[PDB]
């Protein structure tokens, strides 16, 4: 048993969806604690070197970050291993590139370019309501954020809209049947659909039944269901409408692209 926490991470043990080459090396970046966890995040360096290709090595990323050339939720970050998660805001004013981090159908991270009208807020999921010191109510979110004195109408599992400049709630979408959702966990990551039914088993998980826009139906547990508006998404989403094609169609598309 290791006498303390773990500071390394073998490349072969890294999450599958990060898409890291087997021969790249023995080691891989180790994300640091922050807004999101290890298995629900991705480091900055991977976005800035293996995707956008603005850097070729660790050193270039170090210089770019320490020069303060990237903003996260309106705040410059200088850690190459800082974790980037879901429904976050990515801005690079030098090239005027604004992205919101969402999930693709295949179950991997993607950058959705956006406008200036909606980059001042983010959507977050509320999953804990509790009493703090002196008995003052609080709440928490999927990005490790705490807000004091919320409205009583807000309950757990809901979704909250908050300005980037100020962490003040603007509007909240309830968790109810007939609302569009985005799956964010397991075999169905990235699929968009509307709720149809809710079944609860005492002392265990709660299962949600949704129907895609084209009629496909699927299930998952309530721990990975995210609300994105009332019958219509509040934010801009990737080109495809959360439709997971079959193997035949993907093979056809690959053949066309080749």
């Amino acid at each position: 048993m290791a006498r303390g926490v773990r500071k390394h991470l073998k490349r072969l043990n890294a999450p599958k969806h990060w898409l890291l080459d087997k021969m790249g090396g023995i080691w891989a970046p180790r994300p640091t604690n922050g807004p999101h966890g290890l298995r629900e995040c991705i480091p900055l360096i991977l976005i800035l070197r293996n995707r956008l290709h603005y850097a070729n090595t660790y050193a270039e990323t170090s210089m770019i970050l320490q020069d303060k050339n990237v903003l996260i939720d309106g705040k410059p970050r200088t850690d190459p291993t800082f974790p980037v998660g879901f429904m976050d805001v990515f801005e690079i004013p030098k090239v005027h590139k604004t992205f919101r981090v969402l999930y693709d159908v295949k179950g991997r991270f993607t950058l959705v370019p956006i406008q200036s009208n909606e980059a001042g807020f983010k959507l977050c999921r509320v999953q804990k309501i509790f009493l703090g010191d002196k008995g003052m109510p609080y709440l928490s979110t999927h990005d490790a954020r705490t807000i004091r004195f919320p409205h009583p109408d807000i309950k757990t599992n809901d979704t909250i809209k908050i300005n980037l400049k100020t962490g003040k709630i603007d509007e909240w979408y309830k968790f109810d049947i007939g609302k569009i959702v985005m799956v964010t966990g397991g075999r169905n990551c990235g699929r968009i659909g509307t709720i149809q039914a809710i079944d609860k088993h005492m002392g265990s998980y709660t299962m949600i039944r949704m129907k895609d826009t084209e009629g496909t139906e699927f299930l998952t547990r309530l721990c990975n269901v995210f609300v994105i508006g009332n019958d219509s998404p509040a934010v801009a989403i990737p080109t495809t409408k959360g439709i997971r094609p079959d193997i035949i169609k993907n093979r056809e598309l690959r053949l066309r692209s080749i």
Binding site: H53, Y54, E60, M63, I64, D67, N69, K94, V95
Partner: protein
């Protein structure tokens, strides 16, 4: 002299690095990269460029590589692997010292106490 036609591919702008990304392929069914520098310069100072990755395919017909055009020399001076600078006509390379002797010196120094500038 078969005229050597050279292209540019995967061109990207790097205002963060103040440089321009480039993939260059040269068709010589070549002048040791020096003339390729001029050719890339005309495609996109001639000394604000550096060429590092250059391989020759089987048969020698096709050769592809990567470029790197910097806005000004100071940006290059700041952003450039040191050994690349030595390979290019940028700086002189001082005679390196073996790390073994450095390690021995460090250990001996760690041995002595107080003022150890003697060794």
């Amino acid at each position: 002299m078969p005229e050597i036609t050279v292209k540019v591919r995967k061109v990207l702008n790097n205002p963060l690095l103040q440089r321009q990304q480039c993939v260059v392929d040269v068709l010589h069914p070549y002048e040791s990269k020096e003339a390729i520098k001029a050719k890339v310069a005309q495609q996109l100072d001639q000394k604000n460029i550096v060429l590092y990755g250059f391989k020759t395919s089987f048969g020698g017909g096709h050769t592809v590589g990567f470029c790197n055009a910097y806005q000004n020399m100071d940006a290059l001076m700041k952003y450039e692997p040191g050994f690349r600078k030595i390979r290019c006509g940028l700086i002189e390379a001082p005679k390196p010292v073996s790390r073994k002797q450095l390690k021995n010196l460090k250990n001996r120094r760690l041995k002595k106490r107080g003022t150890e500038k003697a060794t």
